[PDB]
């Protein structure tokens, strides 16, 4: 029961600081789980100096 471990296929660096990360395949309904959990953490909990 190791589920589906995906393969990062595309690292499209459009700029020096803007990227597209394409990651397939995931078990059905895990794209949203991972994408939203990340998006939330990145938006509202990453530390920095401002």
């Amino acid at each position: 029961t190791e589920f589906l471990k995906p393969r990062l296929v595309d690292i499209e660096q459009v700029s020096s600081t803007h990227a597209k990360v394409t990651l397939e395949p995931l078990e059905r309904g895990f794209g949203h789980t991972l994408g939203n959990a990340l998006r939330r953490i990145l938006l509202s909990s990453m530390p920095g100096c401002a």
Partner: peptide
């Protein structure tokens, strides 16, 4: 990913 992993590590066992 390292942040979420750490929170789940506390309760993965």
């Amino acid at each position: 990913a390292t942040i979420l992993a750490e929170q789940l590590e506390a309760f993965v066992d």
